[PDB]
Design a protein around this ligand. Structure first.
Ligand SMILES: Nc1ncnc2c1ncn2[C@@H]1O[C@H](COP(=O)(O)OP(=O)(O)OP(=O)(O)O)[C@@H](O)[C@H]1O
Ligand SMILES: [Cl-]
Ligand SMILES: [Cl-]
Ligand SMILES: [Mg+2]
Ligand SMILES: [Mg+2]
Length: 536
């Protein structure tokens, strides 16, 4: 339905990338080099060089294939905190030809159930903080056969990973996995609807990562700290595959409370040269006392996930002397556009295409648009599907086919490309409002509302109108002190306020006051959920 690939028949990140570095150490061609440095922020630290990482990951593969009896192709849910065993287990899965399916420890039992059922997981790997949740729902998951516990303690019904690991052989015969063979399944965030199962192959993660490696400016002798939930695709790409493609060290902090002061102390206390985090990390750091906590070793700061505001960029540069280089992507496509270390930074832009990709702005018929014209961001997938693109939605070929327009995979995001090929994000396409022939981006309206002291949080969406077709509607969470005000009067005041700072065709003709907004587990506002209910 979407091009053929040009790839080697076989590919495996463990054998083709990681084991190279272990072999160099074994052969005396490189000194023993740190690969994984883990700290808990309470005095415990652990470090593996590449040889040790290879050996201990071979033990993990033996545990999974031997003791757990998991066979090539079997699906393994992984729900762990930021502990070194996540890295070991994922590598174990890659070696043993098992499909790893990471998720967040922040899941409720209902979330865990949905994913285990939908995914037909045959195994779950978890820590002691989620086993009680798992054990309330496990009987309802008929494919689930193995429960593997990473803990200092044992629990009846759960296999003891750490004990089995120490018992296992340090030799494992890596499976000769195919480049297009399924390696992972990631659920999408659920921002627009129920989470989708996105299948990735050995090459779409590992070979793509190998091709991208170094875009951050990270080099072989350096340490990168990627700040991420272990359930996100960011973790596999930037915490695991990209440093290890280069022979560099990945730094992991348990960071049990995402505390920005702990982040700051960590930067200032360890020789971290490169860091990756969502824009909120930088925003939080800027609210800390950066006079008192210097980090002269830090060189490269990158971000992904939401728009990097120009003010954030400017403030960071002023306070630290450093740039923040933005990137863009989605579960389905991995790293799609970025500002590489040699590129000029353009505030408000997310960079240029990843090297495997032909990224364009396209019209409603799939035609490439000139620079300066807003349209849909797409990646060319015909006649050749590029390395890095996912394999499709599991059990949902129709949904896969629905996002292909002509020769392009649609990201679902609007954008504009400038004269140098840099992309500017212009919003989720489905969120743009069409009222009286005007297109209205909710972000500008939400920003105008957030200026007003009454507004704590807001979401702007379309609402159906006996006709203007649809109108702009704002859902507003009020500051406590405004709950007492007359709402009709306050509504007019907020309307007038927006009319004062934006094109007055953009103002919310409807305002509904609400006590909360629906969000994903990561805190992303579910505008679709609101739109769906608004439209019945
Ligand atoms: N640099 C960025 N600037 C603006 N938005 C970004 C950037 N990076 C990513 N995004 C947004 O995040 C999206 C990808 O997020 P992800 O794949 O986690 O799932 P999601 O789309 O939020 O959830 P779902 O697919 O279930 O609706 C992109 O399609 C885009 O809307
Ligand atoms: Cl913390
Ligand atoms: Cl920002
Ligand atoms: Mg999405
Ligand atoms: Mg406000």
């Amino acid at each position: 339905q979407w091009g053929h690939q040009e790839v080697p028949a076989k590919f495996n990140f463990a054998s083709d990338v990681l084991d190279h570095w272990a072999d160099m150490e074994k052969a005396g061609k490189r000194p023993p080099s740190p690969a994984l440095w883990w700290v808990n922020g309470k005095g415990k630290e652990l470090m593996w060089n590449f040889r040790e990482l290879s050996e201990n990951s071979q033990q993990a593969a033996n545990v999974l294939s031997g003791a757990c009896g998991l066979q090539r192709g079997d699906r393994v849910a992984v729900v762990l905190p930021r502990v070194p065993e996540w890295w070991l287990v994922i590598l174990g899965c890659i070696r043993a030809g098992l499909i790893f399916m990471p998720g967040t420890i922040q899941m409720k039992s209902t979330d865990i159930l949905y994913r285990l059922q939908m995914s037909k997981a045959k195994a779950i790997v978890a820590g002691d903080e989620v086993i009680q949740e798992v054990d309330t729902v496990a009987s309802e998951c008929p494919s689930l056969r193995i429960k593997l516990l990473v803990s200092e303690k044992s629990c009846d019904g759960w296999l003891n990973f750490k004990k089995l690991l120490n018992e296992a052989s340090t030799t494992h015969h890596c499976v000769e996995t195919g480049s297009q063979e399924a390696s992972a399944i990631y659920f999408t965030s659920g921002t627009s609807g129920l989470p989708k199962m996105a299948e990735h192959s050995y090459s779409s993660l590992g070979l793509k990562a190998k091709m991208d490696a170094g875009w951050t400016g990270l080099q072989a002798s350096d340490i990168m700290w990627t700040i991420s939930d272990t359930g996100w695709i960011l973790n596999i790409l930037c915490s695991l595959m990209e440093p290890w493609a280069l022979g560099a060290c990945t730094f992991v902090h348990l960071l049990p409370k995402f505390d920005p002061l702990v982040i700051l102390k960590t930067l200032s206390s360890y020789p971290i040269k490169s860091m990756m985090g969502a824009p909120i990390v930088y925003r939080m750091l800027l609210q800390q006392d950066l006079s008192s906590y210097k980090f002269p070793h830090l060189q490269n700061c990158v971000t992904v996930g939401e728009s990097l505001l120009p003010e954030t960029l400017e403030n960071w540069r002023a306070q630290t002397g450093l740039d923040i280089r933005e990137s863009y992507g989605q579960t389905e496509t991995g790293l799609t556009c970025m500002v590489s270390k040699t590129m000029k930074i353009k505030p408000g832009y997310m960079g240029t295409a990843a090297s495997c990709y032909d990224v364009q702005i396209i019209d409603d018929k799939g035609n490439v648009l000139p620079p300066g014209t807003e349209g849909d961001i797409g990646i060319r997938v015909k006649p050749i599907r590029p390395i890095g693109i996912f394999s499709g939605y599991v059990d949902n070929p129709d949904k896969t086919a629905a996002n292909i327009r002509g020769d392009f995979w649609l990201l679902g995001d609007r954008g504009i490309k400038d004269e140098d090929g840099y992309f500017q994000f212009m919003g989720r396409a489905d969120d743009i409002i069409n009222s009286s022939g005007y297109r209205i981006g909710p972000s500008e309206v939400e920003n105008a509302l957030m200026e007003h002291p009454a507004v704590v949080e807001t979401a702007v969406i379309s609402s159906p109108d006996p006709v203007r077709g649809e109108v702009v509607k704002a859902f507003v969470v009020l500051a406590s002190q405004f709950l007492s005000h007359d709402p009709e009067q306050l509504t007019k005041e907020l309307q007038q306020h927006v009319k004062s700072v934006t094109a007055p065709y953009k103002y919310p003709r409807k305002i509904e006051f609400v006590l909360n907004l629906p969000k994903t587990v990561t805190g992303k506002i579910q505008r679709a959920k609101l739109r769906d209910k608004e439209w019945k």
